[PDB]
Amino acid sequence: QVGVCYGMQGNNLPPVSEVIALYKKSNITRMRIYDPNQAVLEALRGSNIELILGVPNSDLQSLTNPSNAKSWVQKNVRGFWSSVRFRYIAVGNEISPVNRGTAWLAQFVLPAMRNIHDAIRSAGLQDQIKVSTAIDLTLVGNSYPPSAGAFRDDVRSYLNPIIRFLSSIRSPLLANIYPYFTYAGNPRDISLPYALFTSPSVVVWDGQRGYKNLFDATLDALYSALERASGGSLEVVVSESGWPSAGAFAATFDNGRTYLSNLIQHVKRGTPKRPKRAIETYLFAMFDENKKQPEVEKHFGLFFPNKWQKYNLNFS
Numbered sequence: 001q002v003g004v005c006y007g008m009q010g011n012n013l014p015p016v017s018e019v020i021a022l023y024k025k026s027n028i029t030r031m032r033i034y035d036p037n038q039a040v041l042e043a044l045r046g047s048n049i050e051l052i053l054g055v056p057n058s059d060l061q062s063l064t065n066p067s068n069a070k071s072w073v074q075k076n077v078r079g080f081w082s083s084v085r086f087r088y089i090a091v092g093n094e095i096s097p098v099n100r101g102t103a104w105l106a107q108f109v110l111p112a113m114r115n116i117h118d119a120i121r122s123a124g125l126q127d128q129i130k131v132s133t134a135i136d137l138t139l140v141g142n143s144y145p146p147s148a149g150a151f152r153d154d155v156r157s158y159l160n161p162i163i164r165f166l167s168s169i170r171s172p173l174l175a176n177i178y179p180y181f182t183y184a185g186n187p188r189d190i191s192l193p194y195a196l197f198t199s200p201s202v203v204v205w206d207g208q209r210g211y212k213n214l215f216d217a218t219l220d221a222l223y224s225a226l227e228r229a230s231g232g233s234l235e236v237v238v239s240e241s242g243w244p245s246a247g248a249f250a251a252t253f254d255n256g257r258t259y260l261s262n263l264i265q266h267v268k269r270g271t272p273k274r275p276k277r278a279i280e281t282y283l284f285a286m287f288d289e290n291k292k293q294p295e296v297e298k299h300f301g302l303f304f305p306n307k308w309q310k311y312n313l314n315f316s
């Protein structure tokens with residue numbers, strides 16, 4: 001089942017309780033939150049909803065201290081484990097050692113992960129609850145063609161030991177992935193059917209491998225980079241994907257509806273490189289978030305804040 005990211009940065013959003021109800025109502029059994037909001041945590045009790053619990057980047061620093069991490073796990077994890085199906089903890093989101101926004105935090109990620117996981121195992125929850133981190137693909141320097149997929153040379157010192165850690169505790173890697181921005185930046189080279197999963201024939205040829213949609217190509221591009229960095233056994237959970245209804249080039253209702261509907265359907269299966277396993281995927285995001293900037297980041301909602309659906313999707 002597809003999951004949905006619950007961002008709460010709007011001035012017009014439903015009460016937490018109604019949002020959970022709406023999740024249950026729409027039969028959405030998977031959620032991603034970006035911080036451990038207690039009301040949300042208390043609201044998920046007995047929901048049977050598998051949860052991605054996020055560590056906010058501002059606390060990464062704090063958690064490089066083992067004791068801060070311990071108390072972090074006690075308050076937010078052990079206090080709820082009876083009734084909340086914590087699935088993954090996403091320690092940091094879109095951290096890069098070379099992106100201006102997050103560079104000074106990179107040092108913190110792996111230690112945080114060890115302390116939380118260390119904290120996690122002491123409570124004996126390590127086979128249910130996988131410690132990981134959620135990346136963006138700014139870290140991937142090459143993805144064309146997909147077989148050539150490789151991480152940026154200047155991010156290898158950062159990613160390498162993180163991969164190693166993940167391999168050893170058998171955790172997957174989490175990736176936020178937006179075919180939308182790939183398309184939006186280069187519609188001359190990227191065809192909309194390619195971006196939207198509606199292409200009858202392959203669009204990208206990779207030796208003997210043909211890519212029909214932008215989403216399949218990119219993940220496999222990620223897979224090739226993981227394989228070159230000693231993560232050939234890592235699973236990828238896709239922790240964000242979405243298409244905006246307004247605010248910029250190609251931000252339209254129809255595109256949104258197409259993209260998201262094929263996607264929900266697509267991930268019932270895999271990619272041209274790893275056909276067996278289903279892609280665990282989290283749709284971004286449940287509500288428009290009128291506080292985000294710029295304009296287009298306020299329209300990723302799948303639902304209006306009055307809780308009527310934007311796109312009329314089956315999540316079942």
Ligand SMILES: C[As](C)(=O)[O-]
Binds near residue numbers: 144189
């Ligand atoms: C834009 As190209 C030549 O890397 O497919």
